[PDB]
Design a protein around this ligand. Sequence first.
Ligand SMILES: OC[C@H]1O[C@@](CO)(O[C@H]2O[C@H](CO)[C@@H](O)[C@H](O)[C@H]2O)[C@@H](O)[C@@H]1O
Ligand SMILES: OC[C@H]1O[C@@](CO)(O[C@H]2O[C@H](CO)[C@@H](O)[C@H](O)[C@H]2O)[C@@H](O)[C@@H]1O
Ligand SMILES: [Mg+2]
Length: 580
Amino acid sequence: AKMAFTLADRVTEEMLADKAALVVEVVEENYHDAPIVGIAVVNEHGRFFLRPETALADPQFVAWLGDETKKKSMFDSKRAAVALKWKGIELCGVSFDLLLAAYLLDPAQGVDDVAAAAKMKQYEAVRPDEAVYGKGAKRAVPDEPVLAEHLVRKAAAIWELERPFLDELRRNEQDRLLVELEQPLSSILAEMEFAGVKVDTKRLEQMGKELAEQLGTVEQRIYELAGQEFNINSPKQLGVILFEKLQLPVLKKTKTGYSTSADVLEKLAPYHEIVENILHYRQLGKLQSTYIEGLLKVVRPDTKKVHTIFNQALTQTGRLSSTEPNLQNIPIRLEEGRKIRQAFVPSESDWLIFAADYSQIELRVLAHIAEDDNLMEAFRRDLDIHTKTAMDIFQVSEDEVTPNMRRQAKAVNFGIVYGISDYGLAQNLNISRKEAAEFIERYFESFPGVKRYMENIVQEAKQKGYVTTLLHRRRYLPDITSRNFNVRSFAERMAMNTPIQGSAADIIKKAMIDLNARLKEERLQAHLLLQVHDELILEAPKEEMERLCRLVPEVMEQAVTLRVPLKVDYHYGSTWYDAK
DNA sequence: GCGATCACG
DNA sequence: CGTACGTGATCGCA
Ligand SMILES: OC[C@H]1O[C@@](CO)(O[C@H]2O[C@H](CO)[C@@H](O)[C@H](O)[C@H]2O)[C@@H](O)[C@@H]1O
Ligand SMILES: OC[C@H]1O[C@@](CO)(O[C@H]2O[C@H](CO)[C@@H](O)[C@H](O)[C@H]2O)[C@@H](O)[C@@H]1O
Ligand SMILES: [Mg+2]
């Protein structure tokens, strides 16, 4: 059953045809400055395996790789593109990426290797990467014979599956989504990841020392209030101290003991001083372990930069995710944590950080898709949406809206985007289901368009079996027909939320593509560093700030045309912290 | 490995 | 009749 191929000792013309399935294997999960263990090429002339040191040293092969007119079909082209960037080699002409194709066809399949993608089309003549390389620590690159056949089988699968995948994407009206959106975006994310973000390690270490002292102080205070020393991080021990020694009320338990989540502690705070200290300890410990020590662990010792990897084929809604490190969840909500951002600085002298963010893109998207007259008018007047929602549901004028009213109206708006339910809103606001139901009823009386939309999208999910986004991203919801209330409700909330969060993802992704095109046309040095769901962070010479202030918001606001305007705010400064 | 926890939009 | 939507990293413990 073995697959025939040529284990070449050198590159030949036959291997450089204008169309081929290409495999540039990088086994390390984190591909930054990582080894390329082998190369496979499958084209009209046959199947070939090439040793990396050989192929990458061949001028003809390198030229072929960078020739945009020589088309390549691959799986996870970003991985190869980045690994090649670290070697100073440009990869061009990728016309088809099987990973992105599989992802668009069905995000829920969780495709993360050629074998999983091929299985979708009943093609199984290729092994899963885990089977070949192993997992965790027992992982390793096989001997050449085994490695070579595997890479060739992967290239062969890609060669065979391109057409079937493209045909189905076409039937789904997702052909442009792959070719004009996700694939071009992949190249942009590759540049962003490769550029990396500079870190002021001296700043982080200083913060780490100050946090260590404060943690010591709070730690001693906790032992003092508990009447003894114990492992504050030990659930078993903390549980005994709080709910047994100190007799605090037990409101929530886990599959092993008592729950001490912030949500629980906040309600226990009034009963004992030790609680606020535990919450504070939690806050500092989180910053220290995850954002100081953790971050320092992945900073490149030579350049002092961090190179995240944006997983473009993971989320069920079309969003990106970020890892090692995750640069999409750096603190900002609480001032003490926000300081962490002072450690993220420009990569060059006299450059600055520029951040642009969409204002209420999810609710604006909702106004558009639901075609709700009241909601669309609200955004056309660029009103404070939470104050406006409070005015409508509580039947009062703007001057009569109290802070508590805006807060609750805001919670209602979050629930609306998440997939509203009386139980969900009730838990969030700490009110009764009946009271929550009333808020929801009032909301729908004021936004009948949204109500009709939520009713219709759930019905559509049942009829078609999936929901879609503005640019035709898809998410199947088989549980929408479940006869189990909890299971079905999960699916219903997904039907309501996915088109909103997903369309917002579509919009910013297109904005990124449009932005890079504009930056190149203007030959600006400014470039993207990060994307945080509804915001874009760039760095650029101080001399380019004025032009960026006009260019970035415009490009983001014009990415797509909706029934309501899109609004973008922006800030810039010496550090990410200051870009506010 | 996995549940609890908490960081972000 | 009971979960708010979407993610990732760290730590304690089986
Ligand atoms: O290269 C990113 C791409 O690879 C997948 C597997 O096909 O994920 C791998 O790489 C990630 C980044 O290092 C890891 O977080 C993940 O654990 C590893 O399997 C895809 O999911 C992703 O799109
Ligand atoms: O009472 C109708 C109302 O209930 C929802 C759930 O909030 O859907 C339920 O009723 C539908 C029939 O009207 C079913 O198709 C659906 O499976 C069931 O959960 C809303 O979508 C609907 O407006
Ligand atoms: Mg914003």
